[PDB]
Amino acid sequence: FSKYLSTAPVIGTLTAFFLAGLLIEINRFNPDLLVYP
Amino acid sequence: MVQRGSKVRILRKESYWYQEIGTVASIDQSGIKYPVIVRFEKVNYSNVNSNNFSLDEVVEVE
Amino acid sequence: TLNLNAPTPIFGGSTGGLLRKAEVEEFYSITWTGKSETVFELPTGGAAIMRAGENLLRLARKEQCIALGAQLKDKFKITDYKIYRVYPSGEVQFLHPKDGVFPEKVNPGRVAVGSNKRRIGQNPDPAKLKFKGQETFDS
Amino acid sequence: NLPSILVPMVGIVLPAIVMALLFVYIETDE
Amino acid sequence: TTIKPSAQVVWPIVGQEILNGDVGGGFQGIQITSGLFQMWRASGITTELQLYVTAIGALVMAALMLFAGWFHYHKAAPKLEWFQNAESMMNHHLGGLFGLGSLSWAG
Amino acid sequence: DVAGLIPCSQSDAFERRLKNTTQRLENRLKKYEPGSAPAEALQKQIDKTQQRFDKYRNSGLLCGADGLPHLITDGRWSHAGEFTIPGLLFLYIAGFIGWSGRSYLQAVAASDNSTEKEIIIDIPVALQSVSKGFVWPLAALQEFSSGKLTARDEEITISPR
Amino acid sequence: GTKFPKASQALAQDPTTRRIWYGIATANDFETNDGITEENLYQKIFASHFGHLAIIFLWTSGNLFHVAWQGNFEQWVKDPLNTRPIAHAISDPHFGQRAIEAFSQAGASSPVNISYSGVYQWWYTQGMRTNEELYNGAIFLLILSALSLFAGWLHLQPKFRPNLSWFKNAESRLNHHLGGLFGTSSLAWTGHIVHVAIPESRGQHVGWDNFLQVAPHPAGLQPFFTGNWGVYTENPDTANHVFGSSDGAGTAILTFLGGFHPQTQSLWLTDIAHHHLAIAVLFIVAGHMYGLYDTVNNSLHFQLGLALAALGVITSLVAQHMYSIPPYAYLARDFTTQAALYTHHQYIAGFLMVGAFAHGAIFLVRDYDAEQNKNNVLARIIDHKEAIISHLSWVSLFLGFHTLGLYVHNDVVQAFGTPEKQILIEPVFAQWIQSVHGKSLYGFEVLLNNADSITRVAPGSAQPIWLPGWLDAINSGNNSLFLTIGPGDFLVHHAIALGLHTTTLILVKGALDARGSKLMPDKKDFGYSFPCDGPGRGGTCDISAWDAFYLAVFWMLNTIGWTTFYWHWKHLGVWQGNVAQFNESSTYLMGWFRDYLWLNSSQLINGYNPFGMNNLSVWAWMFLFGHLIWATGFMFLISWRGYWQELIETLVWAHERTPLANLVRWKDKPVALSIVQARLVGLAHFAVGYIVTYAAFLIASTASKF
Amino acid sequence: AHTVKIYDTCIGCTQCVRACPTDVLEMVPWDGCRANQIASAPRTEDCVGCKRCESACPTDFLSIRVYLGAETTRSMGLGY
Amino acid sequence: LADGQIFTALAVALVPGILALRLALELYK
Numbered sequence A: 001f002s003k004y005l006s007t008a009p010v011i012g013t014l015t016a017f018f019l020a021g022l023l024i025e026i027n028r029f030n031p032d033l034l035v036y037p
Numbered sequence B: 001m002v003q004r005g006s007k008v009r010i011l012r013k014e015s016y017w018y019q020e021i022g023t024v025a026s027i028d029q030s031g032i033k034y035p036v037i038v039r040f041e042k043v044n045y046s047n048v049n050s051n052n053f054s055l056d057e058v059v060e061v062e
Numbered sequence C: 001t002l003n004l005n006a007p008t009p010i011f012g013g014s015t016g017g018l019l020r021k022a023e024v025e026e027f028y029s030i031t032w033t034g035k036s037e038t039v040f041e042l043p044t045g046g047a048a049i050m051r052a053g054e055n056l057l058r059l060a061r062k063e064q065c066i067a068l069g070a071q072l073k074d075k076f077k078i079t080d081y082k083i084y085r086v087y088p089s090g091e092v093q094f095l096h097p098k099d100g101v102f103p104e105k106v107n108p109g110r111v112a113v114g115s116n117k118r119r120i121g122q123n124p125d126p127a128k129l130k131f132k133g134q135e136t137f138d139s
Numbered sequence D: 001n002l003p004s005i006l007v008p009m010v011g012i013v014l015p016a017i018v019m020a021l022l023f024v025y026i027e028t029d030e
Numbered sequence E: 001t002t003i004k005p006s007a008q009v010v011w012p013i014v015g016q017e018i019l020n021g022d023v024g025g026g027f028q029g030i031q032i033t034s035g036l037f038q039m040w041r042a043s044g045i046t047t048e049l050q051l052y053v054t055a056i057g058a059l060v061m062a063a064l065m066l067f068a069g070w071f072h073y074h075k076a077a078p079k080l081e082w083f084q085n086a087e088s089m090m091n092h093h094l095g096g097l098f099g100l101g102s103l104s105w106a107g
Numbered sequence F: 001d002v003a004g005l006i007p008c009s010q011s012d013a014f015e016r017r018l019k020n021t022t023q024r025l026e027n028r029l030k031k032y033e034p035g036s037a038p039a040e041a042l043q044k045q046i047d048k049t050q051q052r053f054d055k056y057r058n059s060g061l062l063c064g065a066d067g068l069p070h071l072i073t074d075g076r077w078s079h080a081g082e083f084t085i086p087g088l089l090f091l092y093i094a095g096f097i098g099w100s101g102r103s104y105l106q107a108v109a110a111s112d113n114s115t116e117k118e119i120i121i122d123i124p125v126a127l128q129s130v131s132k133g134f135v136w137p138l139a140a141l142q143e144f145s146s147g148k149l150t151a152r153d154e155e156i157t158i159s160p161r
Numbered sequence G: 001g002t003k004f005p006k007a008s009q010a011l012a013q014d015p016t017t018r019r020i021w022y023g024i025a026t027a028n029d030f031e032t033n034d035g036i037t038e039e040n041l042y043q044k045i046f047a048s049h050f051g052h053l054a055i056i057f058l059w060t061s062g063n064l065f066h067v068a069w070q071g072n073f074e075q076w077v078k079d080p081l082n083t084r085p086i087a088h089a090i091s092d093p094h095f096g097q098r099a100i101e102a103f104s105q106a107g108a109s110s111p112v113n114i115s116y117s118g119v120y121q122w123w124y125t126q127g128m129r130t131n132e133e134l135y136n137g138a139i140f141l142l143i144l145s146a147l148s149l150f151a152g153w154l155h156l157q158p159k160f161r162p163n164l165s166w167f168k169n170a171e172s173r174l175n176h177h178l179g180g181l182f183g184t185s186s187l188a189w190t191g192h193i194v195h196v197a198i199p200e201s202r203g204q205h206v207g208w209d210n211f212l213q214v215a216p217h218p219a220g221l222q223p224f225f226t227g228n229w230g231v232y233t234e235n236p237d238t239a240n241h242v243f244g245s246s247d248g249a250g251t252a253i254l255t256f257l258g259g260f261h262p263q264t265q266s267l268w269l270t271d272i273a274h275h276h277l278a279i280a281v282l283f284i285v286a287g288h289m290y291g292l293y294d295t296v297n298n299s300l301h302f303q304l305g306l307a308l309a310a311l312g313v314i315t316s317l318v319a320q321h322m323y324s325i326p327p328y329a330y331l332a333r334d335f336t337t338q339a340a341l342y343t344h345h346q347y348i349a350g351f352l353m354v355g356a357f358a359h360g361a362i363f364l365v366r367d368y369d370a371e372q373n374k375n376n377v378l379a380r381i382i383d384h385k386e387a388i389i390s391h392l393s394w395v396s397l398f399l400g401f402h403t404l405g406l407y408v409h410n411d412v413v414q415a416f417g418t419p420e421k422q423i424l425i426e427p428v429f430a431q432w433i434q435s436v437h438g439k440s441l442y443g444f445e446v447l448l449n450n451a452d453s454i455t456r457v458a459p460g461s462a463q464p465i466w467l468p469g470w471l472d473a474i475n476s477g478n479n480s481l482f483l484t485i486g487p488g489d490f491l492v493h494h495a496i497a498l499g500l501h502t503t504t505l506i507l508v509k510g511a512l513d514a515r516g517s518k519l520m521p522d523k524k525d526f527g528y529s530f531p532c533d534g535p536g537r538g539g540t541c542d543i544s545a546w547d548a549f550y551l552a553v554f555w556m557l558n559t560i561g562w563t564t565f566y567w568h569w570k571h572l573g574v575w576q577g578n579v580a581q582f583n584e585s586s587t588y589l590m591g592w593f594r595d596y597l598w599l600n601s602s603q604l605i606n607g608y609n610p611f612g613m614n615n616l617s618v619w620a621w622m623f624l625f626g627h628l629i630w631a632t633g634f635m636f637l638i639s640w641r642g643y644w645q646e647l648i649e650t651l652v653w654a655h656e657r658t659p660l661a662n663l664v665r666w667k668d669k670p671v672a673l674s675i676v677q678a679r680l681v682g683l684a685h686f687a688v689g690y691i692v693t694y695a696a697f698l699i700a701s702t703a704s705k706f
Numbered sequence H: 001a002h003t004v005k006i007y008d009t010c011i012g013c014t015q016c017v018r019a020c021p022t023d024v025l026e027m028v029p030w031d032g033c034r035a036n037q038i039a040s041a042p043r044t045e046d047c048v049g050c051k052r053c054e055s056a057c058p059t060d061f062l063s064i065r066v067y068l069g070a071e072t073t074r075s076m077g078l079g080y
Numbered sequence I: 001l002a003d004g005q006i007f008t009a010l011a012v013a014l015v016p017g018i019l020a021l022r023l024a025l026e027l028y029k
Ligand code: CLA
Pocket: D007, D008, D010, D011, D012, D013, G093, G094
């Protein structure tokens, strides 16, 4: 099952699930970041 | 003169593996034209890995 | 030869075969001996029944004869199919096997027609053969 | 008045003529 | 008539909480067009507890079907002759699946 | 003031976008029950709006005649945070993902089954290339100087001429 | 065995319908004919150019005649501020009674077409005033086209055939075309402006009978020989002077005031007089001057690609300069024609620029010889052709990833009730260049906004005289000289830059890969146009150099579609005085959709309602007519051949078995359209439907409002 | 008819002959070796141009080529 | 215009019409 999670669709998804949720949580505490202040 | 197992570079300009590295699987011990059989890591569009070349189309980069 | 008349298979059908092109010029006929009374698909629609025979079938295209001649070699292993093309309202008798053997088998006495003594990367540029009757692949 | 004569001549009649000579020139043979 | 049917509340993030519109009463969400509010009223449902247990009732049924697919391939897989019996299959699906399914729903 | 753009703290069209955004939410609030749960989500929406106008006023942005903040890329250092500063912040992150996947493929290709390790990703070799990917602006400098960042044209395959 | 086509005798043995279609397509391809020689080849090119030259003369005589006969040219000279120009009278038997009342427009008694080519504006400034003057021009161009069709037949006679060495001698060709054709005929056109067009603009009738009597200047040609050329720069037409009368006119003939006329918003004719004068002097002195030259001279397709590249660049040059610098009186005020004139030449310039790379690609299969052409500029661009395509693969993909995402950002952000969060990039680089050219609206204050800069001052010889005229135009917001741009104009120019890079990417893909790849190394053995190499090697559909042209015709239509949608909507707020509609709505793609395609196509689409019909119902018909022909090309594009070949093999059956129709027999065996054939057929219906639909929309959305 | 030319990089694999649906090709002994073979196309008038003989050739950039020439009734594959 | 000028223009248009027919019958040859 660990050798299944190393396959491309799952590790393409959970890291994209990680990188999206990184960006989602950023816009909740830091909303509307147009420019560097 | 190329021997078996020698890593060659292909000078046949029409080939899919032109200017690429391959290892000679065998040579034919007769006077047949194109005797040099090279096996390649990369498959062409017909998904094969071997071809018959001559000694004029290969070198001895080893 | 064509051995016409020879018995057509017990078929009765097929809109899809042997229209007005056949009576003016060039229809074909495939002749075989089928070693059963079994059913086989036609290139027109599908069934007939192969006779004991001397079986013969008049087809429109040579492409439909080799497609049926492949089915008799595949499914029934009767490889004795012998196609023809007809007389005065046709062109050329005895199309296959052209030299008494199948073309995938080697036969001495054949001559290499359409052979080239060069590779394909050794083909000349068309600018070298411009405004001449030569073509960039003929030798 | 000259529009009423000319536009059914090259709108109808003159294409039907050049269609006829072309269709004979196509389907003729040496 | 007055209140628009709604589910799928949208989270207060980058501005998609403008989709949580004035849909009716004291609720804010997406006006849905699936007719589940009219299907559940015809089924007789009056409180959200009867919807909550049916959502649990489908998930245990989902696990029941998923276990049955594991069981009927890995453990107890029927032969070919169990599948080619179309007359007993037509007998069972007509009276049992379609008949009792419309008999029990008539109840 | 680089193209007739008045700053947004004194731009009256930008200060009038706030007057109509909250008036379109206060009238959305005026019908609901004051202690209700959709009432507090509109005040969370009203105050999230006030946290972007006060964030854009004090940041020194440039609002036009419409009243929307315009960005100035010629890069000036007084307007460096628009494109130059997050652009540099972009380029390290994208080159990190770039040099990681390039370092992964050179390690995998000199193995027994290279195409197998592209499907199932070796978490040793994957986390190794992340370690070789954080140092990429330094790592590509000695890679380009060594001669092994690029290949000569007698080694690549090339269409016939 | 038939005779048609005479060109390809191997097509004549084809007994199907393909012979009919391929006879029309291999027709004017003169290198493909059997038995052709290169000496016989160029003479057929030379006579065909005479046949083409007459068609341009017969077409212009038709435009002159139908304005002289069925137009209102004399009625329009007296008042170009209210009178709409009439193209030709309508005579269709299919009209109704309520339609003749609706197409009897511009106050005429007969159904007429309101002209949108603006040859009224062009001939009004060439000097013409009366309907008889246009008819004399139509008579004259029937003589020139007769001169063209005679000389084409004449130069095929065996005593008047030009030699092959006369054709391939380009050294004397460039001396004469820049010298005679470009220089003297610009010096001749300089004679037309000073003798005719300048006094006709000042109230004086100058025709063929009286022009030898009256002189263009009160001191005619006496200071041309002593060197005192400055006396032609006397009192010009003032700001008081209305066009076409003696109301405060002048006597100057070669002035360089710059700027525009204060009432027609057009160029001064004295500027155009001094313009083509100096163009003549440069082209005259440029014609006294005369292993790659052995390639360009030998190859007919090389010079054709360079000509279409030269034509395609200068055709965009017309459209970009004609709307900002209106060269014709009352063309700036005619909004529909100005819109139709930009969109005309830009769509042609795209077709000329695509055909430039197309004919260079034909050169590389037919005429290019890599054993003879080695180590020059040509055989080096082929040598690193993978480096050019991949770097064009980047800048296509670099812009399209970002200027789409810049739009989808502004869409989503505006949709969420927050327009104040958009990424609006002010185009400071181009706004510098307008401030470099003198537009003091922004306030950059260098280079001709700098009043003390060395370019505006010119401290060498006190030169700067044309800058008072230019700087009163670009700073004034009454015309289209260097339009005020904002962040919406940023996003479109990078869509445009995406289009010119992508269309080049496809066109130089099949150009450089016309001679072979790893897929098909022998692509020069199969020609420029051929469908595929089968389903082997993974399948090779659309592989050829013809099908790389064919994909870029979609891209040029899309690029000019991006271009002329931006031209039209920017000017629809400039002309209407509401510039703010393009200001806020063009930053996001819904305002491009709602406020341009939906808002402006309302009065078009009510061309015929169930309560009546308007004069726009010919445009509302041709709108839907253009949708239907565009969608039909999809049928030949999506569905491919062997569906239809097996559909005709049953219609052949149903025709051979139907009684009373079994007797009627074809001579050509009906087949499906070929693979290369219906790519062209599908692209033709696509390209015609692309152009017919916009031309109906661009006309009717502007004629309804102006 | 379509032209079929067989180049000398063929190996006598016999695969293009048995992949021909219209029986154009055949195998023939070779001159300079008298042991190996080569394909040959003596019946090019029958060729429909399907290029199935190129899909079966094992050599890198196949030794048998098909150039679609003039279209007769056989090469158009017409049943009428 | 005048009515006689229209039939004059149609008369002088026969001169390109024979010449276009004469050129195309030579270009075909
Ligand atoms: C482009 C040239 C053109 C012109 C000038 C016309 C003209 C006409 N068409 Mg149209 N039509 C055309 C092309 C054209 N058609 C095309 C391309 C289509 C396909 C889209 C149509 C589809 C169409 C339909 C369905 C109908 C018309 C009709 C008409 C007539 C309407 C006015 C009328 O009824 O007068 C009154 C006059 C008559 C009713 C009789 C006219 C004299 C007849 C046609 C000829 C007499 C025979 C004569 C001895 C020798 C033949 C001469 C003839 C070939 C010119 C008018 C004659 C209507 C019609 O009446 O058709 C005949 C009609 O129903 N058209």
